[PDB]
Design a protein around this ligand. Structure first.
Ligand SMILES: O=P(O)(O)OC[C@H]1[C@H](O)[C@@H](OP(=O)(O)O)[C@H](O)[C@@H](OP(=O)(O)O)[C@@H]1OP(=O)(O)O
Ligand SMILES: Nc1ncnc2c1ncn2[C@@H]1O[C@H](COP(=O)(O)OP(=O)(O)O)[C@@H](O)[C@H]1O
Ligand SMILES: [Mn+2]
Length: 272
């Protein structure tokens, strides 16, 4: 019914809307998307509003349509950081002790002798590590979180990596609802078709965006692309195919390798 009801975001005055802190790449992207083939595949963007001297994107609340929505957020791409973060990490690293601690926790032998000595790692190193223990590197997406109808939430998916492990999370998420799974697959097929023709999509590097899966006990089911905070345009005349492997300088994100794999896994789940 609303994300603020479950609760970066703030309550809107208008019913069915939500406010997200304004970032310049994301505002630029949403503006473009409202005039793109992908218009219906993203939350409606109504412009910017000022609240307590701060800028907020006025968005469709994707949960408004649903009665007790179940939510799964799926981070798309083989790569989860911008190329400019690699350059910045080489020239002027910002060491992060928080990130070192979480690594040691998951895998004590993951950090190098020097990272151990620093008690810190760079963001790109941490994010590359997160890509490899999850499905991101191999399948081009990863499950980040679920918010269930019983108010329960989970982010315990950092080591969800194999095709079967991912299938099992989706199996538990849809709880045997054949109609929700069919509607999700129909929506993902239509999203893939829209992405493959989108003028926006071929011309932008799409990093750190998610597919948001929403469904309810009335068998309502929707999927949207969200979070364009790290989506950036390529130089004019340059396009990405969104399937070929990333090689530093080619800015390839593996987004459609992710969506191809995701469709394949949900299609497998539907045959079970
Ligand atoms: O959708 P969200 O907001 O989670 O974006 C990804 C999110 C990542 O999930 C965090 O790590 P973990 O949750 O994996 O610990 C990481 O700490 C954080 O970076 P930072 O600390 O803000 O520099 C990074 O944000 P961004 O700067 O790329 O937008
Ligand atoms: N338009 C929206 N309507 C409803 N819920 C949303 C919307 N956009 C995002 N959310 C919720 O907020 C979470 C974070 O959104 P996101 O755009 O990734 O922002 P951030 O990265 O700053 O947390 C999503 O996983 C989802 O649960
Ligand atoms: Mn996000």
């Amino acid at each position: 019914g609303s994300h603020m009801s479950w609760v970066s975001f703030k309550a809107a005055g208008t019913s069915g809307l939500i406010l997200k802190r304004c970032s310049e790449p994301e505002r630029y992207c949403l503006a473009r998307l409202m005039a793109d083939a992908l218009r219906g595949c993203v939350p409606a963007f109504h412009g910017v509003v000022e609240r307590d001297g701060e800028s907020y994107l006025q968005l469709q609340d994707l949960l408004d349509g649903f009665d007790g929505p179940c939510v799964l957020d799926c981070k798309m791409g083989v790569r989860t950081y911008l190329e400019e973060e690699l350059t910045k990490a080489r020239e002027r690293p910002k060491l992060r002790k928080d990130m070192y601690k979480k690594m040691l926790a998951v895998d004590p032998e993951a950090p190098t002798e020097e990272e151990h000595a620093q008690r810190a790692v760079t963001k790109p190193r941490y994010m590359q590590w997160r890509e490899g223990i999850s499905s991101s590197t191999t399948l081009g997406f990863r499950i980040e979180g679920i918010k269930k109808a019983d108010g329960s939430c989970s982010t315990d998916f950092k080591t969800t990596r194999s095709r079967e492990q991912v299938l099992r999370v989706f199996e538990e998420f849809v709880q045997g609802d054949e109609e929700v799974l069919r509607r999700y697959l129909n929506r993902l097929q239509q999203i893939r078709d829209t992405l493959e023709v989108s003028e926006f999509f071929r011309r932008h590097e799409v990093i750190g965006s998610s597919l948001l899966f929403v469904h309810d006990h009335c068998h309502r089911a929707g999927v949207w692309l969200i979070d364009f905070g790290k989506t950036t345009p390529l130089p004019d005349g340059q396009i990405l195919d969104h399937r070929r492997p990333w090689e530093e300088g080619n800015r390839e994100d593996g987004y459609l390798l992710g969506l191809d794999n995701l469709i394949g896994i949900l299609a497998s789940l539907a045959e079970r």
